Amino acid sequence: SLLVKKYCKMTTEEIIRLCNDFELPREVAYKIVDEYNINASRLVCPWQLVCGLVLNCTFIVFNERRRKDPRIDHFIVSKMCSLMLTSKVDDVIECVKLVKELIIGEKWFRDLQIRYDDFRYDEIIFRKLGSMLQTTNILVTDDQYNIWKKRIEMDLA
Amino acid sequence: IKLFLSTDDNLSQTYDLSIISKYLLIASYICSYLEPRYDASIFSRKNPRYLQPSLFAIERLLAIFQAIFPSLMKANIEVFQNLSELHTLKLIATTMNKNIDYLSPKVRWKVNVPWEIIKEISESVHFNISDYFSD
Amino acid sequence: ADAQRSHYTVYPEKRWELYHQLHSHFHDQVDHIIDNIEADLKAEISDLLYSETTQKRRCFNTIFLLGSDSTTKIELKDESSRYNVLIELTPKESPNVRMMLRRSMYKLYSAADAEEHDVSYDLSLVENFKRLFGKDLAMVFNFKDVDSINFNTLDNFIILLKSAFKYDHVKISLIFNINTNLSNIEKNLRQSTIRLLKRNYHKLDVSSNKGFKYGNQIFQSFLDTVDGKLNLSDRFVEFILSKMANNTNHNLQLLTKMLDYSLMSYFFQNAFSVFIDPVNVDFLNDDYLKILSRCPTFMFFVEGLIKQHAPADEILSLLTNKNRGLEEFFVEFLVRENPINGHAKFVARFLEEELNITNFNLIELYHNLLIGKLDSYLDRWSACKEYKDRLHFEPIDTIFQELFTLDNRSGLLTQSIFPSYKSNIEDNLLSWEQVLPLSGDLDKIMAPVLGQLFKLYREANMTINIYDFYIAFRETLPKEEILNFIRKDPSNTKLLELAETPDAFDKVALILFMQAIFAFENMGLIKFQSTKSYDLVEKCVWRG
Amino acid sequence: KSRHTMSMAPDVTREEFSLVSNFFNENFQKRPRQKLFEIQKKMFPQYWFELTQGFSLLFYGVGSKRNFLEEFAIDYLSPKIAYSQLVNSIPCLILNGYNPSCNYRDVFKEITDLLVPAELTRSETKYWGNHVILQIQKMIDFYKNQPLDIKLILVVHNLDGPSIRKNTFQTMLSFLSVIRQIAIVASTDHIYAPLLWDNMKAQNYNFVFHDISNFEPSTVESTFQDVMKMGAEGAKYVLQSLTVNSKKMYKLLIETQMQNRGTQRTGVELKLFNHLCAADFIASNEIALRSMLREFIEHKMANITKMEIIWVPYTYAELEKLLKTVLN
DNA sequence: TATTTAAGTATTGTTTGTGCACTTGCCTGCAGGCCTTTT
DNA sequence: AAAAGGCCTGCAGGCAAGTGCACAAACAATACTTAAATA
């Protein structure tokens, strides 16, 4: 299991390998490089934050197929569950959920969301301005919940 | 005998004030000897114990506070809340008037608590103060 | 136009009904305990005010109010054949000795008139009083907020009053509303006058926060007001505990405030409030059926089904494939009574009268309960060892509660009740894009003046020059866009003639600067150090 | 220690300044302002439901509220919530906090008649012994047993105003806001707003906070405040109204002080200045000279230091401008 | 014989005044450090 | 090679340039009081 094998450097070449095997485009690849550069100064355990951030970026760089085809959602966690040599899905869903919370407010995330025009403004205008009708993140959003529901269903049935 | 030897004319209190208030007060005491010439040295991010205290200025108190609060906290609603609490308790009074203090005109703040209650607040909050005073 | 005048006035739902019928029960129990404590305070003060027949009868009896809010109203005995006149002095009413005396005399004379239906505002009014009003006098002084009054003045005033004890047809009593720290008072007065007050004193306390006999009690009443009808996660409880601990004097008022605000948030966004009572099971909609899918309990229990029930057929059939069966599967666990509240009340009243424990908090007790560390809670006193198995309660992991509860995961209330007042401003000023979406060109290629000036602001030292910053901002100023934008309005004549001025760039630079530094003084960031000089200034705020 | 002094700046007449501020502030970020405003207007029923529980609504966030304040209050809240009660739309008591002429005494004299005069409470009017606070205490004792509906909506612009922020005024407004049947909504600009209220005053206010950032130019607020532009130009009008002899003598002064920004080294000595104003036959002696000089001095129209230097602190540019325009 | 308040009284609130200060260069006053010799 | 007479240089001997500024008093007009004119 590589994930449990913490305390390892993922250099510019190594991190660009980790983000090139999955073929991530220019802007997101260079942002991965820069954010690992930053996260090295502020890491606690590297592999967790690394896998979380990369999965959370990949899951929105290609929403035009993930939302379109629920199977590639399982395909990514399967190909990295093996690439990271993980134990099961549970640990990877911990990773994604927590890190996504830890990267949901970073400006780079807003920039990735706004730039590609794929799909945020509606949430910022109800969190900053403070409406009583924003979602309290105790539930899961109907879009990610649709993803989960459909993926686990087509995988089970 | 058990009376002939003490006046008992008094009719160090564990002041009701809270953690944020404890730190506010214990930091607002730090420039009863530490002029702004030294604070940015002994507190950076990298005897006048006897004499009457010199005058603070706001946003210096906030500075030393954010310094010695145990990045953890940046909210300042409870902070200023307890600051006004203090000023109502006349523990850190203003040399200037009683109404315009809460603007930012020329206005100085100074502690009105002696050093023993400072020892008390420090030990109770477990933060140590013997460091910042050096002579 | 006229707006520059001073304050010229201008003379121009089932969920909600449940909010009413429940919020009002909440406030009803609130106000019940409120009047309880109020009558308690009035009763204790009226009691202690009398019956203390001190044979000396040459020194007014003193009543200290430890931790007094200073807002506690006072009542008196009617006590016919003797006026009972209350006198209240504020630290504003006390510029000196003479005016304190005169204001007090006028007040008590007006009161003697109202009770009575040419007089010197002085001590003579005391001894003439009988002759001028018949009944003997008994006044009581209520120094509203003592800590701020200049104690030399108050001392002189008390020594003055001492002379009134040579008439014997009057008696006086003092009511000190100390904010706190009786030691603070006995630090300032002349010891010889303390020895005059110390004749018969009573260190009666007035504090809403004392052993939580009202705090824990109102917390429990709230628990009752919310019993079996919702839930509250450990996050909510710990947040309440934290924000309470930093607000010493008035915990209760703020506690009610935050609870009510959470309830309002719920009943204004939560759609399942109508589903704490079965009488609205017919209030269900297909879209409500959809939204009851995204529950975290929903997905967790789907996973538990897939794991435990190896045959996927039952789970698949009970899934979206059925809607009436699915909603029955949901309402199946809707009636989890959650003994957590019941056993909470149990252990509460138990250690209140069985163990009879007082210096404790039911709030953190309920926190431990939802955690299960209630053992490492009750251990604190070493008296439930024999009971930690009869007061035993392992926390139960109720299900489907993720729809009937309240937790601050979005920080809506926290950000709206306890905002980072300076941090929020610094953020929204420097960033400004998350809020701000012919002339759009400059807005898209040049920040709003406020933030693009704030950012130069940031690199400034303690003392800064006006004009150095002016030039460093001129650098930021695009003259090409300034001529793009000024002549972009041809419709105006005078603005066009302005637009052809050859030195217009630095002129408009000074214009925009002297509007910005203008509007950034009432906002508190910058200080115009030494008005009449304004050659340099200081940057008050720093990011930190 | 050669610092950039605001003296060496391109001054702008009040007309050009006002007009360009107009153009900008009315056209700089219009589309952003209207988008922001139409977006945030959806929050208004949220404010309705919040003020249903009398939570004093405090508004922060950069940019002026005054416009938006009167906008939300006068137009949406008052008449809608008046209709919602089941008739004069509830009088909107706007407090021009930026106006430093507001005083607690008179505004409460208004408030009184606004509030219920059910009894001759004027009989309780007394000496300076403040019946503001005592009478408002009584009014609170009354309202404690009155039905619950807004009978007046007061709104304060810039609660940190130079008058309202006075702690006496603040405490008065606190004990006021304790009343349930009134809706309290206000805003500030001072970033240090929370410094104003202890837990006592917070308990009185029960403040609920909301950010409103729309990045306004603070139109009205720019009016009451004033900066150095709001001297060289001061004297520029003075010299436009003088006698020809004064014109000529100041002409000679400005030549001999501009020959050498008009710096002090470039001035003249009063010895040679008298020599000149006596050679060209202008000054008879030193007394009349200093007399016809102090008319400039008695309005601070020229500088003098020490040689006996009389140096015009007005810029070389502005000085030669005087020459080419108003003197010659 | 009482509602008009107009003038007047008592008081607030604030204005620059300075009275004192305490700062930050300055070369020289001083003193630890280098030269010398002898075994 | 080191220890003892003698003489050279680093530390500061020092203090006027000098601004801040925290003291004070009337301050400009507050806020309110008390006698008079009219029904």
> Which sequence spans correspond to the domains of chain D?
29-230, 231-328
The answer to whether strand F lies under 7 Å from the CB of residue B108 is yes
Which nucleotide shows the minimum CA-to-C1' distance to residue C531? E16
Task: Determine how many CB atoms are found less than 10 A away from the CB of residue A61.
Answer: 19
Sheet bearing C136-143, strands edge to edge? C82-89, C136-143, C170-176, C61-66, C203-205
**How many whole angstroms separate alpha carbon D251 and alpha carbon D276?**
12
Going by beta carbons, is chain C in contact with chain D, meaning 3 or more pairs sit under 8 Å apart? yes
Any chain A CB within 8 A of the CB of C305? no
Closest C1' nucleotide to D131's CA? F32
Whole-angstrom distance, CA of residue C194 vs CA of residue C187: 10
Nearest nucleotide (CA of B95 to C1'): F22
**Neighboring chain D residues of B84 at a CB cutoff of 8 Å:** 194-199, 201
Q: What are the CA-CA distances from residue C212 to residues B22, C52, C251, C351, C391 (Å)?
A: 21, 29, 10, 14, 21
Going by the DSSP 8-state scheme, the letter that residue C143 receives in this structure is E
- Closest by CA to B113, choosing from B6, B15, B9, is B15
Minimum CA–CA partner of D35 in chain A: A125
Contact B64, B36 (CB under 8 A): no
C170, C124 in Cβ contact below 8 A? no
Interface contact D211, partner B, CB < 8 A: no
What separation in angstroms does the CA of D260 have from each of A44, D268, D280?
Answer: 70, 9, 21
Which pairing describes strands D57-60 and D208-211: parallel, antiparallel, or unpaired?
parallel
How many angstroms separate the CA of residue A129 from the nearest CA in chain D? 6
Give the position of tokens 């008072």: C185
> What is the spatial distance between Cα A131 and Cα A126, in angstroms, rounded to a whole number?
5
The answer to whether D168 CB is within 7 Å of strand E is yes
Rounded Cα gap, residues C238 and C230, in angstroms: 17
> Is the separation of the CB atoms in D188 and D159 below 8 Å?
yes
Backbone angles phi, psi at A85, to 5 degrees: 55, 50
* Per-residue CA distances from C39 to B107, C36, C73 (Å): 42, 5, 11
Residue B37, chain C, CB below 8 Å: the answer is no
Taking the C1' atom of every nucleotide in all shown strands and the CA of D132, the nearest one is F31
In whole angstroms, give the CA distance from residue A128 to residue D254: 60
Chain centre to alpha carbon of residue C202: 31
Asked if D152 is an interface residue toward chain C (Cβ–Cβ < 8 A), one would say: no
Kindly report the backbone phi and psi dihedral angles of residue C314, in degrees, each rounded to the nearest multiple of 5, phi listed first: -65, -40
CA distance C144 to C458: 46
Write the Ramachandran bin of D294: left for phi over 0, alpha for psi from -120 to 50, otherwise beta.
alpha
Residues in D closer than 8 angstroms to C5, CB to CB, are: 96, 99
Residues 112-141 of A with CB under 8 A from D: 125, 128-133
D309-311 and D303-305 beta bridge pairing: antiparallel
- D114: chain C residues, CB-CB within 8 Å: 9
> At B93, is the secondary structure helix, strand, or coil?
strand
CA of D143 to C1' of E37 (A): 107
DSSP for C6-21?
Answer: SS--B---HHHHHHHH
Q: Which residues of B68-105 are buried (b: 16+ CB within 10 A; e: fewer)?
A: ebeeeeebbbbbbbbbbbbbbbbbbbbeeeeebbbbbe
B37 is near strand F: CB distance < 7 Å:
no
| Contact across the interface for A132 and C412, Cβ inside 8 Å | yes
Chain D residues touching C524 at Cβ < 8 A: 189-192
Secondary structure of residue D268 in the 3-state scheme: strand
Q: Suggest the residue from A125, A126, A129, A134 to mutate for an interface test with chain D (most D CBs closer than 10 A).
A: A129
Cβ of B110 less than 7 A from strand F: no
Nearest nt (C1') to B98 (CA)?
E13
The DSSP H or E segment spanning D153 is: strand D152-157
Q: Which amino acid is at C108?
A: L
User: Contact, D292 vs D249, CB < 8 A?
Assistant: yes
As a rounded value in angstroms, the CA-to-C1' distance for B95 and F23 is: 12
| CB-CB neighbours of C316 under 10 Å | 16
C238 burial type by CB count under 10 A (0-12 exposed, 13-18 middle, 19+ buried): middle
| C310 burial via Cβ count (<10 Å: 0-12, 13-18, 19+) | exposed
Determined by cryo-EM
B82 in C contact zone (CB under 8 Å): yes
Spatial separation of the C-alpha atoms in residues C179 and C68, rounded to whole Å = 5
Question: What DSSP state is assigned to residue A136?
Answer: P
**Residue whose tokens read 């969920």:** C15
User: Is C416 part of the contact surface with chain B (CB cutoff 8 Å)?
Assistant: no
The Cα D249–Cα D283 span in angstroms is 9
**Other Cβ atoms closer than 10 A to A126:** 19
User: How many CA atoms does the CB half-sphere of C446 hold within 13 Å?
Assistant: 20
Length of chain C: 544
Residues D90, D150 contacting (CB under 8 angstroms)? yes
Nearest Cα to Cα of residue C185 among B11, D14, B36: B11
If one counts every other C-beta atom within 10 angstroms of the C-beta of residue A32, the result is: 24
The reported resolution of this PDB entry, expressed in Å, is: 3.9
Tokens of C162: 């001492």
CB-proximal positions of chain F, under 7 Å:
20, 22-23, 30-33
HSE of C198, CA atoms in CB hemisphere, 13 A: 15
Give the β-pairing of C170-176 and C136-143: parallel
Interface partners of B (3+ CB pairs, < 8 Å)?
C, D
Q: Name residues 161-180 of chain C within 8 A of B (Cβ).
A: 179-180
Q: Report helix angle C215-225 to C14-49, nearest 10.
A: 160
Residue C233 structure tokens: 């996660």
Our CA-based measurement puts residue B54 at a distance from the nearest CA of chain D, in whole angstroms, of 22
**CB-closest option in C268, C467, C511 to D17:** C511
C294:A145 CB<8 A: yes
Tokens standing for D52? 């249903």
- Cα nearest neighbour of C198 on chain B: B11
- Residue C93 has, within 13 A of its CA and on its CB side, a CA count of 26
- Residue from C233, C234, C108, C119 nearest C172 by CA: C108
Paired tokens of D289: 């000279």
Provide the 3-class DSSP secondary structure of residue C506: helix
Torsion over CA: C497, C499, C500, C504 (sign): positive
Q: Are A55 and A89 in contact (CB under 8 A)?
A: no
Please list, in sequence order, all residues whose beta carbon lies within 8 angstroms of the beta carbon of residue C393, skipping any fewer than 6 positions away. C339, C340, C343, C347, C369, C374
Distance CA A120, CA D107 (A): 46
Cβ–Cβ < 8 Å for D192, D129: no
With CB atoms and an 8 Å threshold, state whether A130 touches C407: no
Contacts with C100 (C-beta within 8 Å, 6 or more apart), sequence order: C89, C93, C94, C153, C157
- C1’ E23 / CA B69, Å: 32
- The tokens describing D23, both together, are 């153009």
Strands B92-94 and B109-111: antiparallel
Contact D107 C7 (CB under 8 A): yes
Rounded to whole angstroms, the Cα distance separating D132 from C284 reads 55
User: Which chain B residues 108-127 have CB under 7 A to strand E?
Assistant: none
Give me the DSSP letters along C475-492.
HHS-HHHHHHHHTT--S-
Chain C residues lying within 8 Å of B80, measured CB to CB: 421
Distance between CA atoms of D120 and D138, rounded to whole angstroms? 13
> How many residue pairs bridge chain A and chain D with CB atoms within 8 Å of each other?
16
Q: Taking CB atoms and an 8 Å limit, are C147 and B90 in contact across chains?
A: yes
Neighbours of chain C (3+ CB pairs under 8 A): A, B, D
Determine how many CB atoms are found less than 10 A away from the CB of residue C23: 18
Strand E nucleotides in reach of protein CB atoms, 7 A cut-off: 11-14, 16
- Amino acid identity, position C503: D
Neighbours of chain D (3+ CB pairs under 8 A): A, B, C
Nucleotide E28 C1' to residue D1 CA (A) = 27
- CB-closest option in C291, C402, C434 to A124: C434
Spatial CA neighbour of D129 closest among C497, C111, C61, A86? C111
Surface of D (188-227) touching C: CB under 8 A: 189-194, 199-200, 202-203, 206, 208-211, 213, 215, 217-218, 220-225, 227
Residue D210 touches partner B, C-beta closer than 8 Å = no
CA C9 – CA B133 distance, rounded (Å): 56
